[PDB]
Write a protein that binds this ligand. Sequence first.
Ligand SMILES: [Gd]
Ligand SMILES: [Gd]
Ligand SMILES: [Gd]
Ligand SMILES: [Gd]
Ligand SMILES: [Gd]
Ligand SMILES: [Gd]
Lengths: 340, 68, 167
Amino acid sequence: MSELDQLRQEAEQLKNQIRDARKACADATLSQITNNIDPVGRIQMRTRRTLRGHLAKIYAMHWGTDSRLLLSASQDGKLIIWDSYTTNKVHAIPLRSSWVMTCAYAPSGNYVACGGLDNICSIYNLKTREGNVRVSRELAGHTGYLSCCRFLDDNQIVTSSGDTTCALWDIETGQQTTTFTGHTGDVMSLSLAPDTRLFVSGACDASAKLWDVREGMCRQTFTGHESDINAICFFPNGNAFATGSDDATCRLFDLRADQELMTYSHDNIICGITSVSFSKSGRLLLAGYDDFNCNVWDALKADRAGVLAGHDNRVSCLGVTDDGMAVATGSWDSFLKIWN
Amino acid sequence: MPVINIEDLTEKDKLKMEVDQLKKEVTLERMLVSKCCEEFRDYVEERSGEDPLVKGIPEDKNPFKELK
Amino acid sequence: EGQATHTGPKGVINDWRKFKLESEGCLRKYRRQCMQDMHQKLSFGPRYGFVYELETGEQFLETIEKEQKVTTIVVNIYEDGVRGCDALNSSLECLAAEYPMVKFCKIRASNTGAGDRFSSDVLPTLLVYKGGELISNFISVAEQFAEDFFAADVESFLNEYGLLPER
Ligand SMILES: [Gd]
Ligand SMILES: [Gd]
Ligand SMILES: [Gd]
Ligand SMILES: [Gd]
Ligand SMILES: [Gd]
Ligand SMILES: [Gd]
């Protein structure tokens, strides 16, 4: 007869070694060093625009690289490309599933994507104009819902799934070029690095994995949260990233250190974090909680710098522009708002 | 070292790969947190002063100005 | 709360489930029901209707501590003679009447228990609390509106910061 119990211990002992390698460089926390940096003034953003059109709860959204065109996927099975500046709808795409979990905007503006409980990543060409009937490509493969997707370019797009996997697809052929495996739990979110050679993903196994797109393998595995990581976001300079989990805390992990640099949490905050985004310079970190509230944290001082939307329990999702000019929030009442 | 992979692997096949990743990760050279925080703080501080959401946007330089 | 169930993928999943727990056409109905359920849980009974005057700092502190964890409290720190104040006090009176679920209060800076900390330079100072914590702080609020401003103005202003209920 065979046995795995031993093989299960080599894994724990190795994990143990890694822990000491990390504890060996954990001399100080970030707050310690920044104990002299001046805290930011109280951040109070105000609504500049209100986008009306969706007939249901907003599930996801994503800004366009021009920091003017944005997308929003709604429980109404509709995909909408807006013009934040005027509040006008440029496109409007009917979906087959009302259960869209994510949607992305290609950095070129030519294509748009989205996927949900349909386990399929659908891509739409905005130039050939498929707003009514056409759907360029339906990326089939995953055996689990599509939690997140982000374009690397016009013919390359990565996806994360509840099937425990991440995949790099070739849009033309529609073939799952690379498969990134390792997580032991459903993959919830992923984030691309600025140079697009690396990307990070968070799963329900409570770990963050750094993958190498070109080489297709896992570089490192981060851990600290004891609950699921629901959201993850790369830092502006690409040497770190943030994560939000069901444990009601945000963690700033640095790639070189291979371990968290700081944690953002408060006793009054008891909800899980499902959304995270950095301001342009990275001084600000926006967190979205499951109670539809949003906190603005000071990346350096680990203290709430403010509240976004004034705790009205109406924020279901959000996103910051490339030019750091504004923040968008989606809601369960079907409206999107822009804030400065 | 392949590319495409189906998920119909056995628990063992997964444990194997797992410990291998864990070994590679062990051989990873780590930088002192102390040195990483300094660099983080540096980047942020000298840039936060230009951050539109931190300092605020002059009304004339705001793209989402009161629409007229 | 614990595990997330209203937003992100997790929400899409629970929403789909709750759907069948009612499904067993049907889609649109559910869409409306989700929104209805929500306003209901966010709309609390109209208790107040007037702007209350606090005389001491101990009162300030006592009003935000012992308040329900769901009520929004708008406090106005002013001082007679100081331009804006009166206009603001007139507006708040009309607002308190229109948004009975929100608790509006006023107190003289001199009575705050923080003398010089509130000079007439930053006066008409509007503070907003909720769940015990400060959500907003507006120094020299009167600057947000024209010389002559009325209820409808302060409403439009507070609404664009997500501070007022019922839409
Ligand atoms: Gd502001
Ligand atoms: Gd306005
Ligand atoms: Gd879990
Ligand atoms: Gd410097
Ligand atoms: Gd520097
Ligand atoms: Gd009104």
